[PDB]
Design a protein around this motif. Structure first.
Motif, short mmCIF file in Angstrom:
data_model
loop_
_atom_site.label_atom_id
_atom_site.label_comp_id
_atom_site.label_asym_id
_atom_site.label_seq_id
_atom_site.Cartn_x
_atom_site.Cartn_y
_atom_site.Cartn_z
N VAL A 40 0.83 -1.19 0.00
CA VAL A 40 0.00 0.00 0.00
C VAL A 40 0.88 1.27 0.00
N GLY A 64 -5.88 -9.89 1.61
CA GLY A 64 -4.63 -9.79 0.87
C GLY A 64 -3.53 -9.27 1.77
N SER A 70 0.91 -3.78 5.01
CA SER A 70 -0.35 -3.24 5.52
C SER A 70 -0.79 -3.86 6.87
N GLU A 88 -4.86 -14.61 3.27
CA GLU A 88 -3.86 -14.67 2.20
C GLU A 88 -3.92 -16.04 1.53
N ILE A 89 -4.12 -16.05 0.22
CA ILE A 89 -4.34 -17.28 -0.52
C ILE A 89 -3.02 -18.02 -0.78
N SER A 117 -10.18 -15.75 0.40
CA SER A 117 -11.21 -14.99 1.10
C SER A 117 -12.61 -15.63 1.03
N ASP A 139 -7.73 -5.31 -0.55
CA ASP A 139 -6.50 -5.01 -1.28
C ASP A 139 -5.99 -6.30 -1.95
N1 LIG Z 1 -9.09 -14.11 -3.00
C1 LIG Z 1 -8.00 -13.92 -2.25
N2 LIG Z 1 -8.00 -14.36 -0.94
C2 LIG Z 1 -6.88 -14.17 -0.15
N3 LIG Z 1 -5.76 -13.55 -0.68
C3 LIG Z 1 -5.76 -13.11 -1.96
C4 LIG Z 1 -6.87 -13.29 -2.77
N4 LIG Z 1 -6.58 -12.75 -3.99
C5 LIG Z 1 -5.32 -12.25 -3.96
N5 LIG Z 1 -4.80 -12.48 -2.70
C6 LIG Z 1 -3.50 -12.06 -2.19
O1 LIG Z 1 -3.64 -10.67 -1.96
C7 LIG Z 1 -2.37 -10.03 -2.02
C8 LIG Z 1 -2.54 -8.75 -2.82
S1 LIG Z 1 -1.24 -7.50 -2.54
C9 LIG Z 1 -1.79 -7.11 -0.87
C10 LIG Z 1 -0.92 -5.96 -0.33
C11 LIG Z 1 -0.98 -5.74 1.17
N6 LIG Z 1 -2.36 -5.51 1.57
C12 LIG Z 1 -0.05 -4.58 1.56
O2 LIG Z 1 -0.36 -3.41 1.30
O3 LIG Z 1 1.02 -4.77 2.15
C13 LIG Z 1 -1.42 -11.06 -2.64
O4 LIG Z 1 -0.52 -11.52 -1.62
C14 LIG Z 1 -2.31 -12.21 -3.11
O5 LIG Z 1 -1.73 -13.48 -2.90
#
Ligand SMILES: Nc1ncnc2c1ncn2[C@@H]1O[C@H](CSCC[C@H](N)C(=O)O)[C@@H](O)[C@H]1O
Ligand SMILES: Oc1cc(Br)cc2cc(Cl)cnc12
Ligand SMILES: [Mg+2]
Ligand code: NA
Length: 213
Positions: A40, A64, A70, A88-89, A117, A139
């Motif tokens: 972020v 995410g 974040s 986190e997936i 999620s 995010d």
């Molecule tokens: N449906 C889902 N469920 C859980 N995690 C997911 C997802 N789709 C994407 N992601 C995860 O979400 C992340 C997006 S980047 C997230 C950035 C973080 N929020 C920060 O600012 O530090 C990635 O690690 C990806 O693996």
């Protein structure tokens, strides 16, 4: 060896264990000086800080986690007894995030849930004894914002006052999500403009406050 491992390594080598500020600053330094990453970031971080301070959520859900930037940003402002759940997936990202939380000393305020999620959201009530959420940070993959929000709604995890904070509503963009929340009397929206410095383009966050059904 990956970018995300390199980030984590830069932090362990430069930040101070037990110090969330110094962890944030190191990630920002690395991702600004060496190689960009989708954290972020500090500018949007300032907006996220203000939101947490204004609303003082006792229960936060992040969608995410990635490298934990974040998660560290939010967890460090949580009140005593408050908690962050992050989904986190990708198990490689959950591992980096876990280690980042460990290094920052925030591991007791944050719980990583391993899964998508949409798989985990319907489990929140009975497996993790959640009643309702105070705040959600979206995010993850941009196509998921809308269906997950409707899914949160349907599982009854939102309450009058719940704060949704969505990143990247302009870039890469979440037009269907915005149209829904801005269109709906069930949400009250504010737009927070922010500039992505590396890609030299205007982005923004949307704050959507749930009003109930
Ligand atoms: N449906 C889902 N469920 C859980 N995690 C997911 C997802 N789709 C994407 N992601 C995860 O979400 C992340 C997006 S980047 C997230 C950035 C973080 N929020 C920060 O600012 O530090 C990635 O690690 C990806 O693996
Ligand atoms: O902040 C961001 C900027 C860009 Br560009 C892409 C992203 C993708 C995800 Cl999944 C999460 N955050 C992102
Ligand atoms: Mg983002
Ligand atoms: Na609205």
């Amino acid at each position: 060896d990956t970018k995300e491992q390199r980030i984590l390594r830069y932090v362990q080598q430069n930040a101070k264990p037990g110090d969330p500020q110094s962890v944030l600053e190191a990630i920002d330094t690395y991702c600004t000086q060496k190689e960009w990453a989708m954290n972020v970031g500090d500018a949007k971080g300032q907006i996220m800080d203000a939101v947490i301070r204004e609303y003082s959520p006792s229960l936060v859900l992040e969608l995410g986690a990635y490298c934990g930037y974040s998660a560290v940003r939010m967890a460090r402002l949580l009140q005593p007894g408050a908690r962050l759940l992050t989904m986190e997936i990708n198990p490689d990202c959950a591992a980096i995030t876990q280690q980042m939380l460990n290094f920052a000393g925030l591991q007791d305020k944050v719980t990583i849930l391993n899964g998508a999620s949409q798989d985990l959201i319907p489990q929140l009530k009975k497996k993790y004894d959640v009643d309702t959420l105070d705040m959600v940070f979206l995010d993850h993959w941009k196509d998921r914002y809308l269906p997950d929000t409707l899914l949160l709604e349907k599982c009854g995890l939102l309450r009058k006052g719940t704060v949704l904070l969505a990143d990247n509503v302009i870039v890469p963009g979440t037009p269907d999500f915005l149209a829904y929340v801005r269109g709906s009397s069930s949400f009250e929206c504010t737009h927070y403009s922010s500039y992505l410095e590396y890609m030299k383009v205007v982005d923004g966050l949307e704050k959507a406050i749930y009003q109930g059904p």
